[PDB]
């Protein structure tokens, strides 16, 4: 009797693209690299607070957060933050070390255990 | 050699629960029945503007929108709005006509096509 229309497969890229746009943000994320603010991004608290992986970024709208990362892991930060939206992430043997360090530091427990397996 | 961690199966209910909570809204939706404001909901423009199905609700934060619906279709409005978040919707023979009317009037084109096809299957 019940029929379901299911277009939820579109959600991962719809949310990923919200991050990519950097429009309508309500959270500022500064990326500290050995004492200096090397990178910046903005976030959407409505999306981030719905995700247990992004608990380090659970703040009220209008807030500012500071992340600290090592120079070698800078090219992986954008991918980590997009993963908090899309809930999808591509990991290689050359990036596993950095994603394990980032996930441990920010308590993204699903990603942390996934990288640990690949070590 | 690439390995993909994919937890996107959680997205539908994570977004559905944002609508259910009615917290952190930036859009007011009034449902008008026969000239009177019968019921109300609040929305999240960050989620709605990312969805082509939710076109009729593409507004700037702080806006107020009014939806006119027939009295018989009032029990279906919550499910239509939740569908704009979750991208999942349950349709029965007793609800198909109301979802087809709502989808047509508000331009939810994927749902409109689905109701039209489902009706041919059920009857
Ligand atoms: Zn069937
Ligand atoms: Zn693998
Ligand atoms: Zn039809």
Residue numbers in the entry:
A (entry chain A): 129 to 247
B (entry chain B): 129 to 251
Q: Could you give the paper's own sentences about this structure?
A:
The cellular glycoprotein LGALS3BP (galectin 3 binding protein, also known as 90K) is a secreted antiviral protein that has been identified by us and others to interfere with late steps of human immunodeficiency virus type 1 (HIV-1) biogenesis, resulting in poor infectivity of released virions. 90K is composed of a scavenger receptor cysteine rich-like domain of known structure, a BTB (broad-complex, tramtrack, and bric-à-brac)/POZ (poxvirus and zinc finger) domain, an IVR (intervening region) domain, and a C-terminal part without substantial homology to known protein domains. The resulting atomic models revealed tightly intertwined homodimers with the canonical BTB/POZ homodimer fold, consisting of both α-helices and β-sheets. As expected from the sequence alignment, the two BTB/POZ domains are structurally conserved, with a DALI score of 22.6 and root mean square deviations (RMSD) of <0.6 Å for pairwise comparisons of 119 structurally equivalent Cα atoms.
We have shown previously that a shortened version of human 90K-myc, comprising solely domains 2 and 3 [hu 90K(127–408)], is at least as active as wild-type 90K-myc. Since the individual BTB/POZ domains of both the human and rhesus macaque 90K proteins do not feature a similar oligomerization tendency, and given that a single amino acid exchange in the BTB/POZ domain of the short version of rhesus macaque 90K was sufficient to restore antiviral activity, we determined the structures of the individual BTB/POZ domains from the human and rhesus macaque 90K proteins. We expressed modified 90K BTB/POZ domains that contained three additional residues at the N terminus (aa 124 to 250; based on secondary structure predictions and comparisons with available structures of other BTB/POZ domains) in Drosophila melanogaster S2 cells and purified both proteins, which behaved as a single oligomeric species in solution, to homogeneity. We obtained crystals of the human protein that diffracted to 2.1 Å (crystallographic statistics are listed in Table 1) and crystals of the rhesus macaque protein diffracting to 3.3 Å. The structure of the human ortholog was determined by the multiwavelength anomalous dispersion (MAD) method as described in Materials and Methods. The human and rhesus macaque structures contained 1 and 3 homodimers per asymmetric unit, respectively. The experimental electron density maps of both BTB/POZ domains allowed us to trace the entire molecule comprising residues 129 to 250. Residue 142 (alanine in human 90K, valine in rhesus 90K), the mutation of which resulted in a gain of antiviral activity in the context of the short variant of rhesus macaque 90K, is located on helix α1 and participates in the homodimer interface.
